[PDB]
Design a binder for these strands. Structure first.
Ligand SMILES: [Mn+2]
Length: 259
DNA sequence: GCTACCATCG
DNA sequence: CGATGGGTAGC
């Protein structure tokens, strides 16, 4: 049984403060994809690099206390790719790939364009140059999980107030259209949507108002899976027993064996 | 201090 | 629909 976790820690140090470290072991997971480390290698402790003896790898940004993704794994990954290859986005560190034989897990931090229009443009280009990547990986022949903060809502079911957010970044017709071109066109499987067609599955609630309390959140964290592995998925859930961050850890469980 | 990241109301 | 607001992490 292969348990994979995706979690935007929104600063890994705070998460470890709020008992995320302990949680990693408690969940008895085999792979953990974290987004937004908000730090650098020199900034992280040994436990934030190799939690509980679990191997680990990371991509950090040039900016201190900014962005950064990582992947922990009980098994020693055969190959590792830091950064997409596009320096423009690699200077922010949002892509980390780890091959574990037949399997390849990817931690992705899709840029959020809700801070400025220019950031929205950078996000758009990210999508444009990343689509071909999703396609190539779709045509490798290996089972590839993509855990990440896509920061894009697909349908009206993926967010509580889908009605008053069409003029807001994250639910813009363009972005949603891209996602569609990924699931149906590219042939990826929205693991959660495929396991639970009627469950909202919110994974993020804004600090504004009392949203988190009223379960007024979005679903911006995805695990896009290849058909072969997609079918092998047995369950999934959004862990909320403890709040480590404004995001909630997506825990998917597959009946897979990379060996 | 500066940077980055929409729910409730008028 | 449009006008009108917010608290986080980390340097
Ligand atoms: Mn964040």
């Amino acid at each position: 049984m292969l348990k994979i976790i995706s979690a935007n820690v929104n600063g890994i140090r705070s998460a470890y403060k709020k008992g995320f470290y302990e949680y990693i072991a408690a969940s008895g997971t085999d792979i953990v994809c974290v987004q937004e480390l908000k730090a650098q290698e020199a900034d992280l402790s040994a436990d934030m690099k190799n939690p509980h003896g679990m191997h680990g790898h990371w991509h950090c940004a040039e900016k201190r206390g900014y962005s950064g993704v990582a992947v922990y794994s009980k098994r020693k990954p055969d190959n590792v790719q830091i950064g997409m290859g596009i320096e423009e986005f690699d200077r922010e560190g949002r892509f980390v790939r780890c091959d574990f034989g037949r399997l390849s897990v990817i931690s992705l931090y899709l840029p959020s364009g809700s801070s400025a229009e220019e950031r929205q443009q950078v996000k758009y280009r990210f999508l444009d140059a990343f689509y071909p990547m999703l396609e190539a990986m779709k045509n490798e022949g290996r089972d590839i999980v993509v855990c990440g903060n896509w920061n894009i809502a697909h349908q009206n079911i993926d967010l509580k107030n889908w009605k008053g957010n069409q003029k807001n970044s994250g639910f813009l017709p363009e972005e949603r259209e891209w996602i569609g071109k990924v699931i149906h066109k590219l042939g990826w499987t929205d693991m959660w949507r495929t396991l639970y067609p009627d469950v909202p599955g919110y994974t993020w609630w804004s600090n504004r108002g009392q949203a988190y309390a009223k379960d007024v959140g979005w679903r911006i964290d995805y695990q896009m899976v290849t058909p072969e592995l997609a079918a092998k998925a047995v369950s999934a859930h959004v862990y909320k027993d403890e709040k480590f961050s404004d995001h909630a850890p997506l825990v998917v469980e597959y009946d897979y064996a990379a060996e």
